Design an enzyme around this catalytic site. Sequence first.
Site, mmCIF file in Angstrom:
data_model
loop_
_atom_site.group_PDB
_atom_site.id
_atom_site.type_symbol
_atom_site.label_atom_id
_atom_site.label_comp_id
_atom_site.label_asym_id
_atom_site.label_seq_id
_atom_site.Cartn_x
_atom_site.Cartn_y
_atom_site.Cartn_z
ATOM 1 N N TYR A 131 0.826 -1.222 0.000
ATOM 2 C CA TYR A 131 0.000 0.000 0.000
ATOM 3 C C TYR A 131 0.860 1.272 0.000
ATOM 4 O O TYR A 131 0.309 2.375 -0.194
ATOM 5 C CB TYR A 131 -0.952 0.050 1.232
ATOM 6 C CG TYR A 131 -1.996 -0.998 1.061
ATOM 7 C CD1 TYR A 131 -3.106 -0.955 0.231
ATOM 8 C CD2 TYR A 131 -1.833 -2.073 1.921
ATOM 9 C CE1 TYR A 131 -3.988 -2.024 0.194
ATOM 10 C CE2 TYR A 131 -2.705 -3.119 1.918
ATOM 11 C CZ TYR A 131 -3.783 -3.050 1.088
ATOM 12 O OH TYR A 131 -4.345 -4.216 1.218
ATOM 13 N N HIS A 174 -4.065 6.382 -1.445
ATOM 14 C CA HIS A 174 -4.670 6.486 -0.098
ATOM 15 C C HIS A 174 -3.630 6.640 1.013
ATOM 16 O O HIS A 174 -4.005 6.882 2.148
ATOM 17 C CB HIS A 174 -5.515 5.219 0.150
ATOM 18 C CG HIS A 174 -6.823 5.391 0.865
ATOM 19 N ND1 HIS A 174 -7.601 6.521 0.780
ATOM 20 C CD2 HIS A 174 -7.544 4.504 1.551
ATOM 21 C CE1 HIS A 174 -8.764 6.298 1.429
ATOM 22 N NE2 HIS A 174 -8.726 5.047 1.901
ATOM 23 N N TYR A 197 -4.939 -0.143 9.529
ATOM 24 C CA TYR A 197 -5.661 -0.072 8.286
ATOM 25 C C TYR A 197 -6.529 1.163 8.326
ATOM 26 O O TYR A 197 -7.020 1.640 9.371
ATOM 27 C CB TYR A 197 -6.435 -1.332 7.817
ATOM 28 C CG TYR A 197 -5.469 -2.465 7.524
ATOM 29 C CD1 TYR A 197 -5.057 -3.379 8.484
ATOM 30 C CD2 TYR A 197 -4.869 -2.521 6.260
ATOM 31 C CE1 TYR A 197 -4.122 -4.376 8.204
ATOM 32 C CE2 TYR A 197 -3.958 -3.540 5.956
ATOM 33 C CZ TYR A 197 -3.587 -4.459 6.928
ATOM 34 O OH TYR A 197 -2.629 -5.423 6.680
ATOM 35 N N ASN A 205 -9.582 2.198 7.573
ATOM 36 C CA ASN A 205 -10.963 2.334 8.092
ATOM 37 C C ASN A 205 -11.018 2.116 9.583
ATOM 38 O O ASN A 205 -12.117 2.289 10.147
ATOM 39 C CB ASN A 205 -12.013 1.546 7.310
ATOM 40 C CG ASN A 205 -11.815 0.112 7.586
ATOM 41 O OD1 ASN A 205 -10.850 -0.178 8.262
ATOM 42 N ND2 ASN A 205 -12.648 -0.733 6.976
ATOM 43 N N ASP A 235 -5.375 11.959 1.728
ATOM 44 C CA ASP A 235 -5.788 12.031 0.341
ATOM 45 C C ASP A 235 -7.192 12.609 0.220
ATOM 46 O O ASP A 235 -8.082 12.249 0.979
ATOM 47 C CB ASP A 235 -5.737 10.685 -0.324
ATOM 48 C CG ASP A 235 -6.489 9.593 0.385
ATOM 49 O OD1 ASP A 235 -6.249 9.387 1.612
ATOM 50 O OD2 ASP A 235 -7.269 8.879 -0.297
ATOM 51 N N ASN A 261 -12.744 7.107 4.308
ATOM 52 C CA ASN A 261 -13.012 6.081 5.283
ATOM 53 C C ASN A 261 -12.106 6.149 6.535
ATOM 54 O O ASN A 261 -12.448 5.583 7.559
ATOM 55 C CB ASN A 261 -13.023 4.656 4.693
ATOM 56 C CG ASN A 261 -11.735 4.101 4.065
ATOM 57 O OD1 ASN A 261 -11.600 2.838 3.875
ATOM 58 N ND2 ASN A 261 -10.801 4.919 3.739
#
Length: 196
Positions: free
Chosen positions: A20, A25, A71, A73, A98, A119
């Site tokens: 990631y 994000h 993570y 969320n 972002d 999120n």
Amino acid sequence: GSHMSNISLIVGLGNPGSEYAQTRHNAGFWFVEQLADKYGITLKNDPKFHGISGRGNIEGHDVRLLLPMTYMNRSGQSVVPFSKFYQIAPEAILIAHDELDMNPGVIRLKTGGGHGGHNGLRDIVPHIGPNFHRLRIGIGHPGSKERVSGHVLGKAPSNEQSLMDGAIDHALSKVKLLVQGQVPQAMNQINAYKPA
């Protein structure tokens, strides 16, 4: 704890892991990692707060940096207990993230407002309220709500990456104003950025 609207906690939102790190994000992580390098703030493992965090001096102010490792969320599972433990009010927090609703190479400082569908912010505002500052790093929108996953979890093409990198670099130069409490001036000078 914190003092007034001097910024004393800077949070970068993102997802953990190499798969990631280059995705859109993770724009907030990019900003905070670059800020930590600029000022020599060590970002070290922080299992208690489910993150990576640091503390050090920015321009004569004691500032903490936080990257949740929850993570995206679940970001509030880091930010909320961390800010509460250190007695940091929302008004002294900057969250870099972002922003789908802005172009790559656009960057803005916003105070207040909702999550705009993000999120990570969605996991934070219910707990601490909206009155923290945000560094909105434009990434663009892919069209439909469907496509938002691939968009944010994609690696931007080089032109867009260059645009974002230049906007992030500009914002790094304005952190001095923020840690000094000069939010109005910082907002004017950040929001004025153009890539070319």
